[PDB]
């Protein structure tokens, strides 16, 4: 069974983060931020951080992933949204 699930939007101090994943036989095979902080240096931080989070979500198969340093708000919002996705099953 393969399925795509979108997690709840996490409000952060720098704006919304929202993660979507494909799970296939349970494991994460695709990860993306549907929403991420934008505007000003938040673009730089988003650019920096979310591709790394995405990669770490696909490698982890779980929301037990490490916060990106210097992007702790975005990372915390990413994991909450990703955990939300996993919980939807």
TrEMBL record:
One of its GO terms (molecular function) is FMN binding. It comes from the Bacteria. Residues 13-89 form the FMN-binding domain. GO terms for cellular component: membrane. Coiled coil: none annotated. FMN binds at residues 42, 70, 72-74. Keywords: Flavoprotein, FMN, Nucleotide-binding. This is FMN-binding domain-containing protein. It comes from Streptomyces azureus. The lineage of its organism: Bacteria, Bacillati, Actinomycetota, Actinomycetes, Kitasatosporales.
